[PDB]
Design a protein around this ligand. Structure first.
Ligand SMILES: CS(=O)(=O)NCC[C@@H]1CCCCN1CC(=O)Nc1cccnc1
Ligand SMILES: CS(=O)(=O)NCC[C@@H]1CCCCN1CC(=O)Nc1cccnc1
Lengths: 304, 304
């Protein structure tokens, strides 16, 4: 009973967080095996951030200039390299708490947990989604850079995000663990505006299935629709187009509830056109889109 | 930038979760020092749950009937006792991962993180609040009993909740770590209806301060009110009465933003009377009440 915005247990990732300092800038690093990954903007001063030339700035940096501390103990840096927008600091000690891990690059609409850190110390964990405009709506202050996003499949942590910046509008941008930004963003203090933050339709549908499974059924109507008809309405409301791949992904939820995917689309179409009328669904007055179909199945089945 | 429903990092609590089985019932236990705490209903069969006599049922149980497994290894039970609605199983091994801890009994309106577990294995973490009717709106399935709620102050985990049951309406009830239920609930499969789930006014105000700090200011109006005038409106909307103690607790948020607490009350009064008009505050279409003033300060300051 009940449906909550749930993050993965963060323990495995807490065991990887370290503090990285270069000059007067301190941010977070991810320590996996004998490598510490961190945003390359750790080498910048506030005056460098306006138009940094990372290759040039890195020439003035040596291994001993990167101070890495895990807990209250210092790690010895024996190498450093830049891969895209991340620095990889080779240390002389493999992280004894390194979990089984992968680096994955997620697609928009995919959700993940963020372990927000400051000074290499965890402050909290929350669930995010990669928006269709490649931003994330996180909760990050100065010092949170290097905090990571991840998913866990039993005992393997798939790291998908590393926090790099906040845009002037308060939304967030970062990279995968190979240092490639999600979206068109760059690690520079410049005019970077996000595109349209459309709603992740397949995720809203998954959450409507979660509401039916949990007893919230008032929005179920007597209508059906087609993908093309639904998509005409979805476009109008700034919702992402629904594809047959999304319908296939919702199949297990459709099977468990006996509600055909296109019927749920028609209910969603009426919610968009009529509004909620002061009513709530799973304690929310808006259509939640940061639960994937996989998250709904996992939460409704108790996957550990 | 940004404000998220954030849970505490769960690592310290993950190191305490064990599986407890008695007969055909398997639930979760909390292993701190050489004691495993778990709901006493682990001794019940589905036929016992209708009108259980826990003292009588416990007579038929011996130490060897409680199977405790931490990871894939079995713990030896050398004693057992019932304290209120929890069982304390003494084991021969102190939990090597026992963090610094306290057992606290929270008041309604207080928030906490829940590490939802099944078979002693963590599945997810989310943030909850003890409702004014002493229920919690969690996400718990069969097997989640024994999952705990907690707060962390630097390195000391204060355990405040242990999950025991779901009411027929899908809301949740549990105890503190001394086995005393929050509210009038009992660990019996019987007619237990919750009282009015009023809104935690002081928490809504704290979240409105968080919205102002994060740029969402559209709801700020040109009015002020008094505690008595505000409370007349609060009663009408099923909001908890606001006291001078709550005003004092909001003082740091009032100071940081320069918005007098009573002025924020007047903004909240207008939001109640006029509604949101299709607008959102911190990405929500309803007034969020599961952030305490302390949570707002902690998140807005980056406490680790
Ligand atoms: C906001 S801006 O005028 O576009 N300049 C961004 C500043 C630089 C641009 C280059 C990379 C470092 N940031 C710092 C940064 O974004 N820190 C931060 C703070 C809060 C939340 N998240 C991260
Ligand atoms: C729902 S009732 O008809 O009031 N009976 C409650 C059953 C017994 C009553 C006595 C204690 C054990 N529960 C089982 C229980 O609530 N399990 C569960 C399941 C999902 C979420 N959370 C917990």
């Amino acid at each position: 009973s009940g449906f909550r915005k749930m993050a993965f247990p963060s323990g495995k990732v807490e065991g990887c967080m370290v503090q990285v300092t270069c000059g007067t800038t301190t941010l977070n690093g991810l320590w996996l095996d004998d490598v510490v990954y961190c945003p390359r903007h750790v080498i910048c001063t506030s005056e460098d951030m306006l138009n940094p030339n990372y290759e040039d700035l890195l020439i003035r940096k040596s291994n001993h200039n990167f101070l890495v501390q895990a807990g209250n103990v210092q790690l010895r840096v024996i190498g450093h390299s830049m891969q895209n927008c991340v620095l990889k600091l080779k240390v002389d000690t493999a992280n004894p708490k390194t979990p089984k891990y992968k680096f994955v690059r997620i697609q928009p609409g995919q959700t993940f947990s963020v372990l927000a850190c400051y000074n290499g110390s965890p402050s909290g964990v929350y669930q995010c989604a990669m928006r269709p405009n490649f931003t994330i709506k996180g909760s990050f202050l100065n010092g949170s850079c290097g905090s990571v996003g991840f998913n866990i499949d039993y005992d393997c942590v798939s790291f998908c995000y590393m926090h790099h910046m906040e845009l002037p509008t308060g939304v967030h941008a970062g990279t995968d663990l190979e240092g490639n930004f999600y979206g068109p963003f760059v690690d520079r203090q410049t005019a970077q505006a996000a595109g349209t933050d459309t709603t992740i339709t397949v995720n809203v549908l998954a959450w409507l299935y979660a509401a039916v499974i949990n007893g919230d059924r008032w929005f179920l109507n007597r209508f059906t629709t087609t993908l093309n008809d639904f998509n005409l309405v979805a476009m109008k409301y700034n919702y992402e187009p629904l594809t047959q791949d999304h319908v296939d992904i919702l199949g297990p939820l459709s099977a468990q509830t006996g509600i055909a995917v296109l019927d749920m689309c028609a209910s969603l179409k009426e919610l968009l056109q009529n509004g909620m009328n002061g009513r709530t669904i799973l304690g929310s007055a808006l259509l939640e889109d940061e639960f994937t179909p996989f998250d709904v199945v996992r939460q409704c089945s108790g996957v550990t």
